[PDB]
């Protein structure tokens, strides 16, 4: 996360972190329930063998509320394309159930029509992760969050050098130095409504991080809710 603030105790309980063989976080994810993690498909080619850690806010030491979970089944969207990152969505079935507690809890999955009409028409959403704090910097050891405004669809298409498909939306700032970044991918994009947080996106990609005239690109969760429902039964 470039800019933003550190996630304070219990503020981002639905954040999951994919770790590689050396226990290094390389991507994020969103806790959907006791057995399911939502993440980005491109994150699956970023590591051979990986586990999912929850309840962590500071990768530097052992707090006490952390828990690692092995992945039982990886459910990648078959339409995902490495070339355009279209259909950048995957669900993870964990071998053991997550024990909800302080800093560990699922985000809500909204209904399509309501989400698109009431959630995505609001000014901002919230993205979070352990990703880079600068485009050239190193992964953050502290979990961060950042309010990112929804970007007009027409304007972002004009800003992008790459095709912005119907399965994605833009969020962030034109010139302001705040945005998601490498390492945050697969992470949560949630929208708050009356004190309750609903999953609205998945950190997908961007032309660099927080560049002028460039925005953050997120997978459009409302376009895969049915797919997600199905994925959580197999």
């Amino acid at each position: 996360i470039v800019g933003g603030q550190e996630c304070k105790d219990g503020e981002c309980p639905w954040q999951a972190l994919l770790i590689n063989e050396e226990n290094e976080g390389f991507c994020g994810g969103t806790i959907l329930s006791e057995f399911y993690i939502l993440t980005a498909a491109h994150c699956l080619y970023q590591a051979k063998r990986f586990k999912v850690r929850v309840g962590d806010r500071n990768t530097e030491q052992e707090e006490g509320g952390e828990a690692v979970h092995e992945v039982e089944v990886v459910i990648k969207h078959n339409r995902f394309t490495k070339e355009t990152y279209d259909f950048d969505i995957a669900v993870l079935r964990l071998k053991t159930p997550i024990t909800f507690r302080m800093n560990v809890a699922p985000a809500c999955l909204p209904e399509r029509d309501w989400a698109e009409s009431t959630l995505m028409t609001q000014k901002t959403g919230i993205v979070s992760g352990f990703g880079r704090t600068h485009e050239k910097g190193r992964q953050s050891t502290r979990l961060k969050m950042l309010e990112v405004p929804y970007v007009d669809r027409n304007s972002c298409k004009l800003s992008s050098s790459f095709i912005i498909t119907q399965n994605m939306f833009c969020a962030g700032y034109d010139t302001k130095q705040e945005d998601a970044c490498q390492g945050d991918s697969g992470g949560p994009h949630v929208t708050r409504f009356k004190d309750t947080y609903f999953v609205t996106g998945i950190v997908s990609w961007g032309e660099g991080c927080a560049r002028k005239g460039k925005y953050g690109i997120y997978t459009k969760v409302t376009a895969f809710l049915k797919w997600i429902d199905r994925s959580m039964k197999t």
């Binding site: 219990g10 503020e11 981002c12 309980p13 639905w14 329930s33 909800f100 507690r101 302080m102 800093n103 560990v104 809890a105 699922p106 985000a107 809500c108 999955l109 949630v190 004190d195 309750t196 947080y197 609903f198």
Partner: peptide
């Protein structure tokens, strides 16, 4: 209104 059926309902930041 929506009522949480059990502990740790989705979408709620953990307070206690």
């Amino acid at each position: 209104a929506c009522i949480p059926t059990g502990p740790y309902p989705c979408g709620k930041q953990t307070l206690e």
